[PDB]
Design a protein around this ligand. Structure first.
Ligand code: DTX
Ligand code: UDP
Length: 457
């Protein structure tokens, strides 16, 4: 009694978060993990995705799901394709924000978490009166290389046949030419892919929340350098400690359950990369002669590039070394990596696979293909010391990696005493990533900072 007044409560359950990943699995997956964490804190979370990825996201998922049209003419070059994409999703998401601003079941949107490679989405959020959070899907270390490239002072031009160069940037180890992000692979479209990653920093000072899927201890020096400059929040890994529903889960878990512990080489080049027939044959011949079992993901659209001596969703093998192999179109990667049967991970070093391996304690054989995969491999081998990087036959990044070189790297990681060290290092980093996302860890604290401040008056 006695008093008279109204109390108003701002809590996660009446706070509405919008999330909009770039429509590729290396962008969708870290976003979905973050959304799962945010729903667990009680927030209302709506995931917006393009119609052509919608069924994939639906199969994987508390989370409200909205589709938007693709904006993909499929007939234009990369520049016109992306600009149509930008225009379509700009009006699409603006529309959704406004429906929800006038709705009554849901709270009005408080923030839009958008993919860092769609920086024009900050203009949509701010133009419609809500906060913007930019989710980077690459590590801090390679992201700052893009910032220095955008600043245009340092010369990143390279004529690698004339001389060799080493680049020193603040709070980064020296970077050889092969350590830089790889854009020449894209040939005529190299400038476009380049611009797309440089432009992540066009509005960096206007972003309300700068979110990186990494943990501070993994990237201490450069994260501090970026925290001083832009007040970033390292919130990773967004994947949980010991999930997304992936395909072939029961098949892969049953197969791995029937293998000896620490006996399986897990091989994946991610969702996008496509290897030449020659490269596939080098890998095949290594795997069929090594002293280990193997689980090798070859995507459906890549099966025809397999060697002549090998359509079918999966194939089982006894190898020429007496071991067992399984070739499959897709696997639950996080569950595979955390299986006791897995000895090591031959990976293209996409950032999600890298951080999922780190979070799982699995040493890597690095076969980087392009963009940040080269830089990631440099850190895996020489900084975190949890893998070895293959050497391309010719000196180049697009050069063939021979079976003998693959074999050499298997023997080092899996049979040598150096490999036992690499595995010790990987369990150390596994514990540190677990510590970062547990109560009082830097990533747990940073993600709570994001969540708590959303509630502020
Ligand atoms: C570099 C890029 C954008 C930045 C994000 O990190 C996602 C990657 C995926 C790979 C890359 C895109 C940029 C667009 C791409 C060139 C695009 C392609 C168009 C094409 O004809 O071949 C591939 C699909 C995806 C793509 O291959
Ligand atoms: O057989 C597979 C291969 C990949 N992935 C997942 O797909 C993502 C691949 O992203 P990454 O950044 O490693 O490389 P990209 O596909 O973008 O080249 C990661 O979340 C993997 O966990 C998977 O679930 N099953």
């Amino acid at each position: 009694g006695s008093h008279m007044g109204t109390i108003e409560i701002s809590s996660p359950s009446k706070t509405h978060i919008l999330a909009f990943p770039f429509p590729e699995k290396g962008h969708i997956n870290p976003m979905l993990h973050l959304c799962n964490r945010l729903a667990s804190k009680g927030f209302r979370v709506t995931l917006i995705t393009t119609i052509s990825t919608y069924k994939d996201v639906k199969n994987k998922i508390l989370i409200n799901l909205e589709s938007i049209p693709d904006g993909t003419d499929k007939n234009l070059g990369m520049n016109g394709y992306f600009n149509q994409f930008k225009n379509s999703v700009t009006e699409s998401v603006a529309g959704i924000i406004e429906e929800y601003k006038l709705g009554h079941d849901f709270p009005p949107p408080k923030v839009l978490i958008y993919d860092s490679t769609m920086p024009w989405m900050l203009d949509v959020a701010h133009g419609h009166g809500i906060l913007g959070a930019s989710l980077f899907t690459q590590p801090c270390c390679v992201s700052v290389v893009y910032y220095h490239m955008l600043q245009g002072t340092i010369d990143f031009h390279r004529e690698q046949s004339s001389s060799s160069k080493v680049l020193l940037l603040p709070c980064l180890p020296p970077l050889e030419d092969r350590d830089l992000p790889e854009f020449d692979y894209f040939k005529e479209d190299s400038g476009f892919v380049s611009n797309l990653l440089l432009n992540q920093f066009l509005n960096i000072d206007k972003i309300d929340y700068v979110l990186f899927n990494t943990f501070e201890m993994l990237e201490s020096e450069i994260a501090n350098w970026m925290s001083n400059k832009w007040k970033i929040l390292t919130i990773g890994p967004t994947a949980p400690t010991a999930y997304l529903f992936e395909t072939n889960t029961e098949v892969c878990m049953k197969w791995l359950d029937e293998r000896e512990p620490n006996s399986v080489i897990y091989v994946s080049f991610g969702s996008i990369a496509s290897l030449t027939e020659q490269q596939m044959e080098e890998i095949s011949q290594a795997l069929f002669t090594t002293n280990f079992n193997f689980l090798w993901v070859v995507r459906e659209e890549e099966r025809t590039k397999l060697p002549n001596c090998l359509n079918p969703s999966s194939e089982s093998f006894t190898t020429a070394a007496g071991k067992l192999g399984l070739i499959i179109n897709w696997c639950p990667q996080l569950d595979v990596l955390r299986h006791e049967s897995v000895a090591c991970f031959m990976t293209h070093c996409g950032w999600n696979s890298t951080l999922e391996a780190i979070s799982s304690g699995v040493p890597m054989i690095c076969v980087p293909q392009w963009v940040d995969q080269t830089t990631n491999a440099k850190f895996i081998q020489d900084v975190w010391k949890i893998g070895v990087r293959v050497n391309n036959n010719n000196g180049e990044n697009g050069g063939l990696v021979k079976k003998e070189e693959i074999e050499r790297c298997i023997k080092e990681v899996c049979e040598s005493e150096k490999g036992k060290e690499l595995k010790r290092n990987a369990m150390k980093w596994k514990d540190l990533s677990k510590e970062a996302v547990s109560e009082g860890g830097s990533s747990d604290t940073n993600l709570e900072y994001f969540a708590s401040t959303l509630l502020f008056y």
